[PDB]
């Protein structure tokens, strides 16, 4: 780390410092990572630590074996194995419907194992400042460390929808069950006629086999583990049957899956010790937190609940069979086993201090954590009597923002180029521009938000306004809701479901508003870091550049108010806001081009007034000299119809002058970057071997080779060049020359022109996809020959048409179906389905980013910026 | 000490101020939201409507001829940028078709893309912005090739914008008749003939054509509390509702129960002679710890089916949101003055 002035972060609260002699092997697709994980688990002998945001054992690693199967085979192979798994725990029952079977799968992981209980599970409780607002916060730590020698870190968690190939195919028939991931569409398949496994069935079956402190007592009986032979389970040990959603509906054959792009790495060296120390400290802290005695009233409630469960089991004549462990078919006592936490104090489990090796690939591990979490880990260390040796410069009390400060330092130290590829983008943008408080709430958002606007006569009879204000099912008037249901009309029949959905959305609207007072604004500073570096490049008049690759819109349907608010904040941060990235770049370029004949203090006002177009001076500048904001898209033919679908860019990768390849699990939102809300594991890898490169086509440069290859493969897939034959998207071969030049202008001009061509072809074919100018405006009462050429920007639902966008007294509606609707995909008999001619001229997956989407449209849900 | 909004007049107890369009926002008035007090203590949708060819108008605060010129500059820039986007679409389509025509490539779509290009080029000339004169002193009047619309005016450092959604072939005739009938007006001045009353303006007519106006009001003594007045004709083509801009969020605000307590607000208030309800809410601090802040809401809307609809909406703004630096008075402090104002409302 001497070839560049830029070095790692060096403060006080850092979790650890840079460690050399690491064997780093990056991963670009999910399939490769899963296969390597299968091989490493097959090699495992001593101890395994697993932590992740969402852990699923249904997933297939090598295409034939699942994660739980691989772990069980590892346990069978090694009679001295020790497995500790630490997922993230939701404080409520579930934020959504991801899964809830991780705990019972780990339970069944010890079934039939000779010897004592060699596996332990411990859900991780979030810890922050006050936690009243923090209940929503989580853990975004992803890591698997094997035998204290091989470790993993990245963004690809062992979950559904992450294993993707180089082709980016939209066909979903190949995947099984929950592996067909596409949150946007309303899934319309069905798997569990007589084949698949019900989610509730296996859990009540395990309750039958056994024969808020509920989670505490469930983990207590988990700790009191029957590792002996209890029952050979068919559906996971010799008949690997897939699970299903709570409604057990799948993605239909003619419905496209949603491609998933992510990055990951494997590590080998002394930094695996760093990851192991992190896991051990967190495990000890959570055990110490568990050591606290729960409420006696809660204990009595759980005792009554289990008594009722066993009474129901006894009443079930078929289920009332025989029991042998801790229950003995009701012939034993109750279940109040004394607590006994299992620390990681065994010297075999403690990792040995590793030596300092030279060269290789130096790695730093970055963590963000709260003061509560740090003091809990101190309590755990004192309780378990474990104190691993630490380097000089590490802290144990305070707050970490290692990912944020690391990104800031890389930005402040970059020299030529930066490439970013993320999932979110939410930083400061100033006060909102082109959006004002006098302006009425947008069309779709107002339709979602206001509840008395539609059918005032039908709402004044139900009078459920007070019911929804007071949040009471009993206060909800059964007589009035039944009267409205029995009211004549097909539109009324649909309105019943619509208003049930509205209540489901609006039932809880008072989470935390006046915690202090209502404020607006984002906190993290990555956007202004990019802007300041770009402005320094402007000031010194030397070449510099930054990319950004992000998804088109966040995961899920575009009719969810929080997703719409994230689109609003994304557009404000990117472009719309008055002091956004584009605005800051334009202001600096105008200040530079107007530095000739202008007073110093005067120029700060001279760059402000308008031109003959009416727009201010700095708006005339072109920012494409510092910014290439791009997305990813594809298309296919499934079942005889043309389909298109976005590629969700879920990776969190970052590059710094082909010398650093950042990677981890920190988004570009405040909840992950600020430090006091969520915890993660990001790494900061540094090369140790030099390589020549002609970055800008004229001047030689000395950078790394692994980083160069990683970026080359990222682009190579991004352009469709690496995919296999037979795909629907042709390769972008003309960029094979430009891929290796990130500093030459012609490279970004070529890629930008290709992006625009792809976008134009997609616009020619479709109109429901997000674009700038709405195409549903033509399908209206106004006639084209009169002289109506306005061209209004498309709304957040691009088929929504505005009669007059300035106010809301006019209003509008949708003219053609949106993909999240059911009439889009289902050929209803009373109507005729719409098909589209195939697109043409489309090469690659990258398309232009629409910066006129939702222009002058107010999409704010009024909910907490934190939640 | 009296003022008129729409077609109704009332008596004001002490000093008052109307809501007019933002001076910093005057130039971008084609995208009109409405008048405001300041950036944050506004309401939603303060503008007037008139049945003369679907007319809407705004009134600005004290601005100058530089901003008056900037307004038309913005209106021209919009059409300029649309033309640029339309031209780049043609460029991209031409490149696409040139790459498509390659050795008996995809067929049966050349006619489709060509007819698309034909439509795209047919809709090109209609987007030009043309200026007119009409012999009106200091008027930036715009419009299409033959049919004009988007009226502009500048009198007494004000702006009067008049747009019509469905102008016919005689649009210039109609709008010049309308602006001939238009006349400026001053605060605390009430005319003696039928017409329309909006802040600093009055257009006389026969007194029968439909109308719909809405504006906000605030006492200069108590800037923390504002009142928005709503007026409309009987059975108007827009059928405006009494709430009109509340979005069911000001009805049910969010707050922490730990430090404040809320209660309903049902009071008595008669507008003109008829008696009106007053349904809203109140937010009260709790004596557990130091909490000196208040907020409340209310709405009274008697009328509409036969007489003109009259609605009064009361909305409070917290201390420190803006230049205002005073605590929010409790409702019982300011409701007597609202009762005094509401009882003096009469139609012309």
Residue numbers in the entry:
A (entry chain A): 28 to 238, 417 to 1072
B (entry chain B): 26 to 373
From the paper:
The structure of the PldA–PA3488 complex indicates that both proteins tightly interact with each other, burying a ~2020 Å2 solvent-accessible surface area, and PA3488 acts like a crab claw to clamp the HKD2 and CTD domains of PldA. Four interfaces participate in the formation of the PldA–PA3488 complex. The specificity of binding is due primarily to a salt bridge between the Asp643 of PldA and Arg50 of PA3488, combined with complementary van der Waals interactions between the Asp643 of PldA and the Gly70 of PA3488. The results suggested that PldAD643A and PA3488R50A dramatically decrease the PldA–PA3488 interaction, which is consistent with their functions in stabilizing the PldA–PA3488 complex through forming a tight salt bridge. In contrast, in the inhibited PldA, on account of the binding of PA3488, the 310 helix melts, allowing the region to instead form an extended loop, stretching out and following the α3 helix direction and resulting in the formation of a shorter α3 helix than that of apo-PldA. On binding PA3488, the whole lid region slightly changes its position and orientation with respect to the active site, sitting on the top of it and almost entirely occluding the entrance of the solvent and substrate. Of note, the α5-α8 loop of the PD1 domain in the inhibited PldA is structurally invisible in the electron microscopy map, implying that these helices are highly dynamic after PA3488 binding, and this accordingly imparts flexibility to the lid region.
PldA is mainly composed of 27 α-helices, 25 β-strands, twelve 310 helices, and many loops, folding into three regions: the core catalytic domain (CCD, aa 24–935), the peripheral helical domain (PD, aa 215–441 + aa 647–721), and a small C-terminal domain (CTD, aa 936–1094). Compared to the open conformation exhibited by PldAFL (pre-open state), PldAtruncate presents a highly open conformation (open state) and the PA3488-inhibited PldA reveals an almost closed conformation (pre-closed state).
